[PDB]
Every structure is written in C-alpha cells, then in structure tokens.
Amino acid sequence: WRRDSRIAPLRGALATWGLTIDDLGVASFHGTSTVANDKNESDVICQQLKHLGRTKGNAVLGIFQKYLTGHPKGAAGAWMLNGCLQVLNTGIVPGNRNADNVDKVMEQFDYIVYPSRSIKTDGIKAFSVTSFGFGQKGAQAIGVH
Amino acid sequence: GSQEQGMGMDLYATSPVAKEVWDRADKHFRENYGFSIIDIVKNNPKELTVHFGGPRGKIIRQNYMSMTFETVNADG
Amino acid sequence: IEPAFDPLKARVYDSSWNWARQDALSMYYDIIFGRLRVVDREIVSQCIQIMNRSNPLLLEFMQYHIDHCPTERGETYQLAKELGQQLIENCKEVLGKPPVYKDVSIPTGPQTTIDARGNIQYQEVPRASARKFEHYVKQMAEGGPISQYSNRTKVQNDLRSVYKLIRRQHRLSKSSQLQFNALYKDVIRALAMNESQIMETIPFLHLRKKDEFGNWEYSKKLTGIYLDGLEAAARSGLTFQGKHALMTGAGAGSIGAEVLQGLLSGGAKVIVTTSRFSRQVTEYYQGIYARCGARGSQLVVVPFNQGSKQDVEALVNYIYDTKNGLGWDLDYVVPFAAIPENGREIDSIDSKSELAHRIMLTNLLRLLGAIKTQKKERGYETRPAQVILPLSPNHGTFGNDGLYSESKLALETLFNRWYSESWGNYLTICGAVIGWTRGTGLMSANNLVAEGVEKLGVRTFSQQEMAFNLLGLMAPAIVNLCQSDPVFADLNGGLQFIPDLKGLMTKLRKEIMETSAIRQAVIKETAIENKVVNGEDHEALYRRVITEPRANLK
Amino acid sequence: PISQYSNRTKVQNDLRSVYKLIRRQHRLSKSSQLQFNALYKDVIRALA
Amino acid sequence: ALVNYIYDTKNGLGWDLDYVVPFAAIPENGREIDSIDSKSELAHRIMLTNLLRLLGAIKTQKKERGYETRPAQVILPLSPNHGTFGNDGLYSESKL
Amino acid sequence: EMEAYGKFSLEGCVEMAWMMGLIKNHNGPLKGKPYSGWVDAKTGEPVD
Numbered sequence A: 001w002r003r004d005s006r007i008a009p010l011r012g013a014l015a016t017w018g019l020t021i022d023d024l025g026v027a028s029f030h031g032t033s034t035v036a037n038d039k040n041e042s043d044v045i046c047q048q049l050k051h052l053g054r055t056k057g058n059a060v061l062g063i064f065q066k067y068l069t070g071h072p073k074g075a076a077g078a079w080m081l082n083g084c085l086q087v088l089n090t091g092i093v094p095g096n097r098n099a100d101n102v103d104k105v106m107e108q109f110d111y112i113v114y115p116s117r118s119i120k121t122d123g124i125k126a127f128s129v130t131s132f133g134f135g136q137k138g139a140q141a142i143g144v145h
Numbered sequence B: 001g002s003q004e005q006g007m008g009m010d011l012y013a014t015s016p017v018a019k020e021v022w023d024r025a026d027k028h029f030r031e032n033y034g035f036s037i038i039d040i041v042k043n044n045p046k047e048l049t050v051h052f053g054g055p056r057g058k059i060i061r062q063n064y065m066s067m068t069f070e071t072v073n074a075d076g
Numbered sequence C: 001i002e003p004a005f006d007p008l009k010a011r012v013y014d015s016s017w018n019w020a021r022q023d024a025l026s027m028y029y030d031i032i033f034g035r036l037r038v039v040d041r042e043i044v045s046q047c048i049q050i051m052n053r054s055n056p057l058l059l060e061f062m063q064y065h066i067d068h069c070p071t072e073r074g075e076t077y078q079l080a081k082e083l084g085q086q087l088i089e090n091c092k093e094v095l096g097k098p099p100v101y102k103d104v105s106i107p108t109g110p111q112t113t114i115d116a117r118g119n120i121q122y123q124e125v126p127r128a129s130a131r132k133f134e135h136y137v138k139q140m141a142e143g144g145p146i147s148q149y150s151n152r153t154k155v156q157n158d159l160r161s162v163y164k165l166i167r168r169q170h171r172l173s174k175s176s177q178l179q180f181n182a183l184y185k186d187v188i189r190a191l192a193m194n195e196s197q198i199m200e201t202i203p204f205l206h207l208r209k210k211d212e213f214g215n216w217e218y219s220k221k222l223t224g225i226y227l228d229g230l231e232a233a234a235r236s237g238l239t240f241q242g243k244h245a246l247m248t249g250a251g252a253g254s255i256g257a258e259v260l261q262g263l264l265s266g267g268a269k270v271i272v273t274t275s276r277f278s279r280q281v282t283e284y285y286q287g288i289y290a291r292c293g294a295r296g297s298q299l300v301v302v303p304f305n306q307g308s309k310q311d312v313e314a315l316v317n318y319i320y321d322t323k324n325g326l327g328w329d330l331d332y333v334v335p336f337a338a339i340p341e342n343g344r345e346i347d348s349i350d351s352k353s354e355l356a357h358r359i360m361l362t363n364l365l366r367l368l369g370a371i372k373t374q375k376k377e378r379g380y381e382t383r384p385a386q387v388i389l390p391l392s393p394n395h396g397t398f399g400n401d402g403l404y405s406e407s408k409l410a411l412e413t414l415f416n417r418w419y420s421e422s423w424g425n426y427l428t429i430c431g432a433v434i435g436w437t438r439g440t441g442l443m444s445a446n447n448l449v450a451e452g453v454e455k456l457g458v459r460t461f462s463q464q465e466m467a468f469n470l471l472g473l474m475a476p477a478i479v480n481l482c483q484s485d486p487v488f489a490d491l492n493g494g495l496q497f498i499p500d501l502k503g504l505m506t507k508l509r510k511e512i513m514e515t516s517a518i519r520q521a522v523i524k525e526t527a528i529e530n531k532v533v534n535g536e537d538h539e540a541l542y543r544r545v546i547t548e549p550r551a552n553l554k
Numbered sequence D: 001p002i003s004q005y006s007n008r009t010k011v012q013n014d015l016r017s018v019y020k021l022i023r024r025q026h027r028l029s030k031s032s033q034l035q036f037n038a039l040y041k042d043v044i045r046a047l048a
Numbered sequence E: 001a002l003v004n005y006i007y008d009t010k011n012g013l014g015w016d017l018d019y020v021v022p023f024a025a026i027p028e029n030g031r032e033i034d035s036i037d038s039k040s041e042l043a044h045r046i047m048l049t050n051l052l053r054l055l056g057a058i059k060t061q062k063k064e065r066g067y068e069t070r071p072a073q074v075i076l077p078l079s080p081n082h083g084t085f086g087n088d089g090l091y092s093e094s095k096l
Numbered sequence F: 001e002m003e004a005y006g007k008f009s010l011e012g013c014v015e016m017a018w019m020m021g022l023i024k025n026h027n028g029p030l031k032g033k034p035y036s037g038w039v040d041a042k043t044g045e046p047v048d
C-alpha cells in the first residue's frame, strides 16, 4: 500500500492483516477536556472512518484516558498507547467515568460512541490512538491484535 | 410584511386609549385561545405553547377542536 | 438554615441518545456472557428503556451489531441475535411514540428469619401470589377480609345503589321519587350526626371524598377511576412526555428516588434537589438518567436546603427565570424533603425538631407559595401544578415523632385552603397518605417486624411499589380530578384497621430481639463451658482454621 | 332546626313508608323490585 | 424560664399546676400560602411550637419533682377553621 | 486497575502501598522473635 493512490494508508496497514475499517474497534482519543480538541478529534476520526467505507451503524468505542490521569503534556500518547495494548489483551473497554453528559455536538458523529462505563467484549481486533499537539503537531497510530 | 417587533408598544404606554384596545384584544386571546398577542409582539418567540389546564383550561382546547377546515375531494 | 442553592453548581443531564447506544451495546455482550439470561426480568426492563430512547440512528447501531452477530460460536450468540432482532423490531414501532414508565419488576415481600445461631437476617422474597405488577394492582384493589366493609360504610354504599336504582328507573310518580330522596337524606344525616343511636371490602388503595360534614369517606367512584389507571399503568405503561416537575427529598434509595426514575422513563424533565451535593451524589443521579432517561427527558440536579427560606425562593426563581434560569413551568411538585427527628416526645422539642418542622411544613408551604406567585405573575393561568402532599396515617398514634405528626397533620389544612384561598388554578392538591414502605428509608429498622405485622392480613410496600402507586396519582385521569377538586388518596396498606400499631410492632420488635439474643447467648455459654471441661488446649486445637487471604502479584 | 337528626325509630318508620309506597305502586320490573328488596334487607341488617 | 419560676421552691413561687390555659396568640390576618412572612412564622412559633414546649416543660417539672398524682388540665384552644376561611396565614396550620 | 475496574485489588493496594513507601519488606528479628514480610514503613510493626 506504499504510496498507492487507491489505498488509504489506514486501509493498507489494516488489510495487510486481513482486516477492514469495520474491524477497527476502539479509538483512544486525546480528548483533553478542552472545548475544541474534542469536537475536532471526533470530527477527524469520524470523517476518516466514513470516507474509508465504515459501514453505517458500526461505531467505535471511544476512550478518553485523560479523565483519570490528567494531561501529561508530553507523555500523553504513551499512556494512551498502553491503555490500548491493555484493552487489546483483555477485551475490556474502559469507560469515561467523568462523562457527565456528552455534548449534543457529539451526536452528529455516528461512528463514535462514548461509553461512560466499562464494557467487557468478546474481543477487540485493532485500535486507533490519536494525539494532537501545539504547533499543528497531529499524530495517529493503529495497533492490531 | 411591514410587521416589526414591539410595534405600537411605545404608543401603547403613552396612549390610555390604545392601551385599552390592545388589552381588550389580549384579554380575549388569552381567555379563548390561551395566549397573548401582546407578548408575541413585545418579545417575538421562535415558539410558544398553550396549555389546556383546569376549568378554563379545557374550555380553550374546545376552541382549538372547534376549528373547521374545509377541502373537498376531486369527486365532490 | 444555611442556604446552599447555587445556579453555578447546577448539573444538567440530557444526553439520552448516547446512553442508549451504550445500554444497547452493553446488553448485547451481557447476553453473550450470560449476565443476562432470557429469564431475568432485568432484560425486559433494559429493553423497555432502550425502546424509550428510539432514534433512527439508534436502529442503525442496533442493527449492524446484530447483523454481524457470530451465531456459529455459541447459544448465547444465537440467543443474542434473536432477542436483538426482537428488540430492534419493537423499537421500530415505538418511534415517535411517547416513552413509558412500566414496572416489570417481580413484586417482592418482607421476610425476616432467625438462623439457628441466633443470626437475624431479612431478605425480600418474591411474593408467592403475584408475579407481574398487574397482579399487585389486582391484589390491592380486591381487598383483604381484615378490611371488612364497616356497618356505616355498608349502610351507605347500599342506600346509594338503592337510590341509583329507584332513580334511574323512571315510572314512579315524582310525588314518591321527590319523597324518597327526602327519606334518603334523612338517613344519611342521622348517620353522620349521631351514629351511636342509629346503629365487601375497602381497596387497600382508595381515594375518598368529603361529606357535608367534612369527612373523608371511601368513594368507590374515585377509587375506581384511580385503580383503573393504576392497572392501565401496570399493563401498557404510563407516559409523562412534555411534563416538567420539581422533586425534593429524592435522596438515594428513597421513595422520591423511585418516583424520579418513573418520570424519567416518561419524557419528563425534572429538577432534583440535594442537600448533600457531592460528586458521589452527582454521579448517582447521572447513573439514573443514563438508564432511565427516555427521549425528551432531562434531569437537572442542584444543591438546595429546604430549611432555608432564601433557598426556597431562590430555587423557584432559577426554575422560572427565562434568561439566566432554566425557564420552566412546573407540572408536578413532589415535596418529599424530610428529617429524622426520632426519639423525642413533647417532653423535648429540640433544635432539630424545630428545624425539621421548618423543612417539613413552613418552608414546604412557602415552596408551593413561591411557585404559585411565579405562575400568577408570569401569566401561566391554564397549567396548574399538581402537588403530591406526602401526608401520614400517624397523627400522634406512634411514640417519639417529636414534631413529626404536627407537620404531617398541618399539611392537611391545604385540602381546604385550595377552596378558600385564591391559588386554586395554579396549584392542585393531591393528599397522598403514604403507608409503610419497608424499602430502606425512614422506616428501616421497621423491617424485622415487616412480615410480622403483615401476618395480620394487612399489606406493607416496597419502594418501587409505592412509587408506582404515587406515579399513579400522577396519571392524567386523576390529575384532572385534582383540577376540579383536591384528592385524598389512602395509599396505606389497610393498616387503618390494626389499632395500637406501635404497640404491636414494639411487641414483635421485642420477641425477635429477645429470641435471637437468647439463642446466641447460649452459644457463648456452652462453647465457654467447653473451655472449662476440655481445657484451653483441647478446645483450641479443634476450631475451623479459616485461612486468612493474602495477595499474590502474578 | 339546624342540628336535626332522626331516631333509629324514625329511620325505620321512614324505611317503612318508603318500601310500602314504592312497592304498593307496582311500576318496577321484577328485576328492580327484586334487588330493591335485596338492598333494603342489607340496610335493615346493618341498622339492626 | 417561666415554668421554673413557677415550680422553684426556694426563689420561685414553688407551685404545681392544676390548669394550663395557653391562649397566647397573634393576629396574622391577611396572608395566604401566597406569603407566609416573618409575622406568620413567629405567630406559628407562639401558637404551636412553644405552646407544646410550655406543656412539655411543665411535665418534666412534675416528673422530676415527683408530682405524680396531680395531672394538670390543659385547655387547648382549638378551632373550627381548618383552612375553611381565607387569609389565616399559618393560623389554621397551628390550630390543627 | 483504576481505569478499568475503578478500584484497587489487594494486589493493587500492595503495589501502591509499596511504591508510596507505606510498607517495606523485612527479613530479620522484630522485637526478638524472627520475622519476614510486610512491615509498616512508619512503625517498625508488621503488616498482614
């Protein structure tokens, strides 16, 4: 998929293990509790899933570790990555305890569902951590079981 | 088309006469259809809801029920 | 009396759409692991709330997860996909359709037991006679022999239908008909004025009406029209769509708490007050709304102290203020705020008592008062607010209420003020006289004697039951009765026939405490006699060695 | 005249002429006259 | 304080009561549930909460003083108006 | 443990207790009699 105009690097990396966007189960969000970063994140991951082909009705469990840990400026991504590798090995998708009441804005993101409590599943196949930084510094990593 | 918010309300406070014209109209509307046009005029609500409460509550909905529309079928 | 209300601490929960897909996706896996077995009433309940929040978008999410269910893996998976597609279909036919409070729980009763070791425990065992709520509704409405239609109540209800017959059969001269109700009224008045010279069942749950001589006498007409809806609720449920309501005293695990969830399952927006506004308390009410909040519903929690005049007027304002408030108008008011003033006779009405009385009466009235003037001023003329007055059967019959009875009794003057004073069409009064609710609340230690007292052919209630009953008087049928006439509503388990109830209880109270004490006493005695006879050594070496749990870090 | 009430006696003697008049008038179906009697008896029981 | 003066042997007038006639009361005319004001809350405290406490005080006095065989007759001034009349304002509530 | 279950297990607590410095291992005489295992870091006392 290296430089293929007809294959999104997301598709690629996933398909090489025999998976599609639909297998992408959990997305760990930067979700820093700031007004804009949380709209944006959903919006990006959403547009991503949509345009790739994600089949309507199949939502990604969205994780927001920051509620528990706070935002360690630099080590943010590492903590989240740990979380996912941990979800991967337990099939447990932790909930956002501090999800008072999700912003009505987040309704328009069909492909994302924000769990306020933990959910034990039959398993998760692949995940997507995504972080953003000062000075237009956006990164994303996809991990597979 | 020329309707504007709070129209003729200034003249309302200033003229004891016009004062009463509005009142009698409002008094009517409130007791029969369950809303005030004076309110609608002063502060233009993007929505408003009437309630069919007790004794005088039910009598209102009666008037809403007794609204006779008429459209004939293409057979007559 | 220290104010505690602060608009900045207000928490609004309204995100039903998300909690849906959660509780949905949550149930799916629940089945696959068997946390939910097809049996469990639970699943039913869950499904109904998922029905209550029915979006188009919910269906899409509902569907996909089903469509791809790996049935070939196990029964559970099949069982899931089944119940899944099942639910999805139901959800389809209830789009737009008002959400409903429907209590599918398994009616439960009280059961205290004394273990052979003297251990006293109290479970809540499924009622052997009822399984759905419909059964409860019936069981209630039917009656108990213990509530045998009294002489006067019989003489009356009979003479009633005598007139109803004689009357609605027009072929007798109006000379005689006219002269019948003459001799009829005579009988009724004489009965009322001097009963002493002249002279099937009663619900467990009945309304009443006032006599010419202000008496609250059992009215079948109402008790009917009520109980009817009460049954209609147990069946096809009951909606509160579009209604706004204020509730105080909705603490965790209280009657209010249940009633809350009730209205939350209808499309009801309610503002709940807490005098112990914590994170924990914040979270609790979230937990509720996450699982009860039907489409259209809204929960707004807020700190508040009904002991504070200031708070009262402040609260009310937040509620009505268009600009910076949450600009509502109230449909229900459920003033269940209350303090345990246990332990005091007129002997000693202390600080607490005076305070309690101020929460439970003076400020309560002021709470209603505030709401009224709000409506009056705001021109809200055609939308009376139904007040569920929590009245009591105890008007000094029980011991150390200490200013309790005084409050609960006083409240009843409202029955008349509704007529005399000028707030009739702003507030309506529904005097719910709540009966024994064994559910962990203001009658907790009264559970040991719960089944005992019930032995005498009378009934005690679980909270979910009482909430049901109350939500009943919340139903449209009754609400309209209130708009023309205050409503009495005896929701006492017919304990109106067990006299000296406090004596009975304390009697049972004793026995249970006594027989258990003896039992465990002896145990010590005898196991101590053994140390005397077999020596410390023999006895010591022969006791169940119960390993102490350690921890290993694997 | 306001606090007027009738003795047990009057209550019966009034139940009498009510029944006597309504009955010796025979205008009621055997149903009504049947259960009118029915109801009358109950009343007369409870009142002794 | 009153009650104690009444019973104190030494410096009080060392009585024991046979009758108690608690007719203390304030005119709270003019107020509906509309507006239970300062006056009303005060009136209710004179007419009920402190009334009960007056009785209560007397009792404990007797109990403690061994006055066992001389009950004091309390003439409770109750009322026919339990909210039937207009602007009692907390009046009925006390009397009931 | 915290992110997932919402509270610590005894295993968790022991780890936290260890790193926070509340307990430390001991392997010698404690008040004359020998002992090995967890000890309250603050008081020389043993902990179960």
Ligand SMILES: NC(=O)c1ccc[n+]([C@@H]2O[C@H](COP(=O)([O-])OP(=O)(O)OC[C@H]3O[C@@H](n4cnc5c(N)ncnc54)[C@H](OP(=O)(O)O)[C@@H]3O)[C@@H](O)[C@H]2O)c1
Pocket (backbone or CB within 6 Å): C248, C249, C250, C251, C252, C254, C255, C256, C273, C274, C275, C276, C304, C305, C306, C307, C335, C336, C337, C338, C339, C340, C359, C390, C391, C392, C434, C435, C436, C437, C441, C442, C443
């Ligand atoms: N259960 C029965 O048998 C029975 C009988 C007759 C009447 N009732 C009525 O039922 C209603 C509900 O009480 P309950 O017996 O179900 O339970 P409860 O244990 O008496 O509940 C009392 C609740 O009132 C709130 N509260 C306490 N102090 C307050 C204050 N100072 N200001 C504002 N709120 C305060 C508390 O809520 P927070 O924790 O959120 O602060 C608390 O959870 C009461 O009105 C009671 O009189 C019940």
